[PDB]
């Protein structure tokens, strides 16, 4: 697969607590399908390093589905990025 067009994502389910200590979300994609999703997260203070620990391996958009993403994030102020689609995620705890 090729990489999903970073400009063609929208939120279907915004990032939310999963009930088992993870962050789940769902996106819709409006480019060529199928494709591999570029998903990352960035901590305030370090714009270069992907801090998202993916539980869903190799997330993809298929023709008939895909777009569910599950991850864990470090404590503090983060931003989640699916392509260029973004959402803040402040992670409580330690």
């Amino acid at each position, epitope marked *: 697969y*090729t*990489m999903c*067009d*970073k*400009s*063609k*994502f*929208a939120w279907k389910r915004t990032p939310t607590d999963s009930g088992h200590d993870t962050v789940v979300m769902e996106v*819709t994609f*409006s*480019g*060529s*399908k*199928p494709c591999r999703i570029p998903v990352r997260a960035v901590a305030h203070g370090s714009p270069d390093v992907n801090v998202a620990m993916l539980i869903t391996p190799n997330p993809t958009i298929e*023709n008939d589905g895909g777009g569910f993403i599950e991850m864990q994030l470090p404590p503090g102020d983060n931003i989640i990025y699916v392509g*260029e*689609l973004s959402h803040q995620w402040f992670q409580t705890g330690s």
Partner: antibody
């Protein structure tokens, strides 16, 4: 250079169907989306839909999903739009245009337009 | 859906002068804004993409700017070939890739 060559005018009765073509040359057909745009005389541009020839993926404007059908033929580097059940509301110029598959941010080259005139 | 509202609807100006026309989006489109010029009876021509990048062959007297929901196209030193209708279009995140209603520039 990039060229999108569209087919000739269609003067048809209400209720007819038409199929127009858009032949691409000067680039790799499957690396670029083909979008279609409607323009009534003296009015603005309207996005109909698009096809990714490399994958077959299509997107349709909700207002046209019962009116337009988009297909593509990789072997002939040709994209097709079919319009069904024509009314006078369908009389317009229809353009095909090219965008980049994978970072689709503009219709960067445009065909010359196919005029459809629905007439008694 | 995103609505794009272009302003002014029409304007008349003279060769050599400057004009500014604008395109307002109903939601944030993250600079995914393209500008086209269309002469009467001709096909649209891409002028600007990603709100500020000139397309190939477009002269530097065109400049695109803006962000968020507000975008501007400025034409310095108008030339006779600059008449026509100008349209904006967005490509952010989900179709329809709607067009603004157009601005008609007449060279006085």
């Amino acid at each position: 250079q990039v060229q999108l060559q569209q087919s000739g005018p269609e003067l048809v009765k209400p209720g007819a169907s038409v199929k127009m073509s858009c032949k691409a040359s000067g680039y790799t057909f499957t690396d670029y989306v083909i979008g279609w745009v409607k323009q009534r005389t003296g009015q603005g541009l309207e996005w109909i839909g698009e096809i990714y020839p490399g994958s077959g993926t299509t997107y349709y404007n909700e207002k046209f999903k019962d009116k337009a059908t988009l297909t593509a033929d990789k072997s002939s580097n040709t994209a097709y739009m079919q319009l069904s059940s024509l009314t006078s509301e369908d009389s317009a110029v229809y353009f095909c245009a090219r965008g980049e598959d994978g970072y689709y941010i503009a219709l960067d080259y445009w065909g010359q337009g196919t005029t459809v005139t629905v007439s008694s | 859906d995103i609505e794009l509202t272009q302003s002014p609807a029409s304007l008349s100006a003279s060769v050599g002068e400057t004009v500014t026309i604008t395109c307002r989006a109903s939601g944030n489109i993250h600079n995914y804004l393209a500008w086209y010029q269309q002469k009467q009876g001709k096909s649209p021509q891409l002028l600007v993409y990603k709100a500020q990048t000139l397309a190939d062959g477009v002269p530097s007297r065109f400049s695109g700017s803006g962000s968020g929901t507000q975008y501007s196209l400025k034409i310095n030193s108008l030339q006779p070939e600059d008449f026509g209708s100008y349209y904006c279009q967005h490509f952010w995140s989900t179709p329809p890739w709607t067009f603004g209603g157009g601005t008609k520039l007449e060279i006085k």
